[PDB]
Amino acid sequence: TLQSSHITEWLFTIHDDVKKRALECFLETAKVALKGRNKKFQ
Amino acid sequence: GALNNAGKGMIETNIGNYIQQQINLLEFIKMEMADVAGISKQREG
């Protein structure tokens, strides 16, 4: 099954890259939201 | 007397054997490409 997992690991690799970039995006979004007078972050 | 006997005719064509020949050829060519690429069936899964 490992050699069959190799066939779709390209999908999984690009998916992992997209997830990483999306999480950097969310991190910057949260950083901007911090300086907006929200008491949740406290 | 052939009008009261001889059974019933059949418009039958041996297309199934042709289809099996095509399927066997496809399997052979796919195996040949796998061998040439060095990527065997046991090596893909």
From Swiss-Prot, chain B:
Subcellular location: Virion
Function: Forms the portal vertex of the capsid. Probably involved in head assembly, genome packaging, tail attachment, and genome ejection.
Subunit-level organization: Homododecamer. Interacts with the Cargo protein 1. Interacts with the major capsid protein.
This protein's name: Portal protein
Gene source species: Bacteroides phage crAss001 (Bacteroides phage PhiCrAss001)
Residues of the full protein shown: 505 to 549 of 806
